[PDB]
Scaffold this active site. Structure first.
Site, PDB file in Angstrom:
ATOM      1  N   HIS A  71       0.850  -1.250   0.000  1.00  0.00           N
ATOM      2  CA  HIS A  71       0.000   0.000   0.000  1.00  0.00           C
ATOM      3  C   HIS A  71       0.848   1.248   0.000  1.00  0.00           C
ATOM      4  O   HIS A  71       0.418   2.270  -0.583  1.00  0.00           O
ATOM      5  CB  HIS A  71      -0.980   0.062   1.212  1.00  0.00           C
ATOM      6  N   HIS A 118       5.614   7.171   6.246  1.00  0.00           N
ATOM      7  CA  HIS A 118       5.365   6.735   4.904  1.00  0.00           C
ATOM      8  C   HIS A 118       4.828   7.899   4.124  1.00  0.00           C
ATOM      9  O   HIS A 118       4.604   8.984   4.679  1.00  0.00           O
ATOM     10  CB  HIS A 118       4.365   5.574   4.888  1.00  0.00           C
ATOM     11  N   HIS A 122       2.099   9.126   0.654  1.00  0.00           N
ATOM     12  CA  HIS A 122       1.065   8.855  -0.352  1.00  0.00           C
ATOM     13  C   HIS A 122       1.392   9.724  -1.565  1.00  0.00           C
ATOM     14  O   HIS A 122       1.848  10.878  -1.341  1.00  0.00           O
ATOM     15  CB  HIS A 122      -0.367   9.214   0.140  1.00  0.00           C
ATOM     16  N   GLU A 157      -3.347  13.502   0.320  1.00  0.00           N
ATOM     17  CA  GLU A 157      -4.626  13.030   0.903  1.00  0.00           C
ATOM     18  C   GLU A 157      -5.396  14.282   1.428  1.00  0.00           C
ATOM     19  O   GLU A 157      -6.504  14.573   0.960  1.00  0.00           O
ATOM     20  CB  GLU A 157      -4.335  12.039   2.030  1.00  0.00           C
ATOM     21  N   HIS A 215       3.481  11.198   6.076  1.00  0.00           N
ATOM     22  CA  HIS A 215       2.852  10.944   7.362  1.00  0.00           C
ATOM     23  C   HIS A 215       3.847  10.327   8.371  1.00  0.00           C
ATOM     24  O   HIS A 215       4.382   9.225   8.126  1.00  0.00           O
ATOM     25  CB  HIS A 215       1.699   9.951   7.167  1.00  0.00           C
ATOM     26  N   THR A 221      -6.151   6.888   7.395  1.00  0.00           N
ATOM     27  CA  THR A 221      -6.672   7.128   6.032  1.00  0.00           C
ATOM     28  C   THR A 221      -6.638   5.816   5.218  1.00  0.00           C
ATOM     29  O   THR A 221      -7.019   5.881   4.072  1.00  0.00           O
ATOM     30  CB  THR A 221      -5.840   8.190   5.281  1.00  0.00           C
ATOM     31  N   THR A 222      -6.241   4.700   5.799  1.00  0.00           N
ATOM     32  CA  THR A 222      -6.442   3.359   5.135  1.00  0.00           C
ATOM     33  C   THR A 222      -7.155   2.462   6.114  1.00  0.00           C
ATOM     34  O   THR A 222      -7.177   2.719   7.303  1.00  0.00           O
ATOM     35  CB  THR A 222      -5.128   2.649   4.758  1.00  0.00           C
TER      36      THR A 222
HETATM   37  N1  LIG Z   1      -1.001   7.682   8.599  1.00  0.00           N
HETATM   38  S1  LIG Z   1      -2.238   7.018   8.049  1.00  0.00           S
HETATM   39  O1  LIG Z   1      -2.198   7.021   6.521  1.00  0.00           O
HETATM   40  O2  LIG Z   1      -3.442   7.602   8.592  1.00  0.00           O
HETATM   41  C1  LIG Z   1      -2.180   5.322   8.623  1.00  0.00           C
HETATM   42  C2  LIG Z   1      -1.363   4.970   9.692  1.00  0.00           C
HETATM   43  C3  LIG Z   1      -1.405   3.674  10.204  1.00  0.00           C
HETATM   44  C4  LIG Z   1      -2.261   2.701   9.647  1.00  0.00           C
HETATM   45  C5  LIG Z   1      -2.470   1.366  10.239  1.00  0.00           C
HETATM   46  C6  LIG Z   1      -2.728   1.212  11.590  1.00  0.00           C
HETATM   47  C7  LIG Z   1      -3.021  -0.036  12.114  1.00  0.00           C
HETATM   48  C8  LIG Z   1      -3.054  -1.160  11.300  1.00  0.00           C
HETATM   49  C9  LIG Z   1      -3.346  -2.523  11.899  1.00  0.00           C
HETATM   50  N2  LIG Z   1      -2.572  -2.688  13.158  1.00  0.00           N
HETATM   51  C10 LIG Z   1      -1.228  -2.828  13.251  1.00  0.00           C
HETATM   52  C11 LIG Z   1      -0.936  -3.034  14.576  1.00  0.00           C
HETATM   53  C12 LIG Z   1      -2.173  -2.990  15.223  1.00  0.00           C
HETATM   54  N3  LIG Z   1      -3.177  -2.765  14.375  1.00  0.00           N
HETATM   55  C13 LIG Z   1      -2.806  -1.005   9.946  1.00  0.00           C
HETATM   56  C14 LIG Z   1      -2.537   0.244   9.421  1.00  0.00           C
HETATM   57  C15 LIG Z   1      -3.025   3.073   8.548  1.00  0.00           C
HETATM   58  C16 LIG Z   1      -3.001   4.367   8.044  1.00  0.00           C
HETATM   59 ZN   LIG Z   2      -0.682   7.815   5.526  1.00  0.00          ZN
END
Ligand SMILES: NS(=O)(=O)c1ccc(-c2ccc(Cn3cccn3)cc2)cc1
Ligand SMILES: [Zn+2]
Length: 258
Positions: free
Chosen positions: A62, A92, A94, A104, A117, A196-197
């Site tokens: 992703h 990371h 986007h 985003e 981010h 945001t994912t």
């Molecule tokens: N920075 S951001 O784009 O908003 C953003 C930041 C983090 C995640 C994220 C957070 C948690 C998981 C699942 N997980 C892992 C350990 C415990 N739960 C997967 C992805 C998704 C988007």
């Molecule tokens: Zn992000």
């Protein structure tokens, strides 16, 4: 048939597996600069990255994550709108298939070429999995990228990407200093939102810096050589991995600056 950014599994489909996609505090949002209110009670942000320990870079299918040792208070964000101490766990980006899209958040509907981010979690919850279950669990520092002059502090990231071309690939990535990715000013907007994912959890205090960083065309072209697929799978370039702006609903965006 899992979530992603294509026609059949992209942002408009996420709500079927993740109903919170249609929630009350989803991210990103458009930042209407004229409606954001100056909050003179917001403190300067404190970004303390001098003792940061980067470990590894991962293509997770992703985006790519530069991961840090977050087993001690070494790289922390505090102040600003935050109560407490938030530890950097990863950053990371986007980005777009073209320089005219990729961010985003938007600013008065403007899209930047990319958005960085820096993800942090609130130490009062003990670790990251616990923090994402709380409404003040995470603080994500967002920084816009525009195409112009190169960002010299980005080059080490750009140059390792050929080693993590495909999903599930990782590489050692020690001694990378994320201070070299910050603009001069820490003036910001802040609001309460979400990942945001997927899983799209409503656990984020968003802190978006007003000043973009400039990166070169050649730097962003190298992001666009990454792949969403795994090795030995048909090649699908990792581009346009951004969620569009979501409804602001009952939220106010606050500005640290006049
Ligand atoms: N920075 S951001 O784009 O908003 C953003 C930041 C983090 C995640 C994220 C957070 C948690 C998981 C699942 N997980 C892992 C350990 C415990 N739960 C997967 C992805 C998704 C988007
Ligand atoms: Zn992000």
């Amino acid at each position: 048939h899992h979530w992603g950014y294509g026609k059949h599994n992209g942002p408009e489909h996420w709500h079927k597996d993740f109903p919170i996609a249609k929630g009350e505090r989803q991210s990103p949002v458009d930042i209407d600069t004229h409606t954001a209110k100056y909050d003179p009670s917001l403190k300067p942000l404190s970004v303390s990255y001098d003792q940061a320990t980067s470990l590894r870079i991962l293509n997770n299918g992703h985006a790519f994550n530069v991961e840090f040792d977050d087993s001690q208070d070494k790289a922390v964000l505090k102040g600003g709108p935050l109560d407490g101490t938030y530890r950097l766990i990863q950053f990371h980006f986007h980005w777009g298939s073209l320089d005219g899209q990729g961010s985003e958040h938007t600013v008065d509907k403007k899209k930047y070429a990319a958005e960085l981010h820096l993800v942090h979690w609130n130490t009062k919850y003990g670790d990251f999995g616990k923090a994402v279950q709380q409404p003040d669990g995470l603080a994500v520092l967002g920084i816009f990228l525009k195409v112009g002059s190169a960002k010299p502090g980005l080059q080490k990231v750009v140059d390792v990407l050929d080693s993590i071309k495909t999903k599930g690939k990782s590489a050692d990535f020690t001694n990378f200093d994320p201070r070299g990715l910050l603009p001069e000013s820490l003036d910001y907007w802040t609001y309460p939102g979400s990942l945001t994912t997927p899983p799209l959890l409503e656990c984020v205090t968003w802190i978006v810096l007003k000043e973009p960083i400039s990166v070169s065309s050649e730097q962003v072209l190298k992001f666009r050589k990454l792949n969403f697929n795994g090795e030995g799978e048909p090649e699908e370039l990792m581009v346009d991995n951004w969620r569009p702006a979501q409804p602001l609903k009952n939220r106010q965006i606050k500005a640290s600056f006049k």
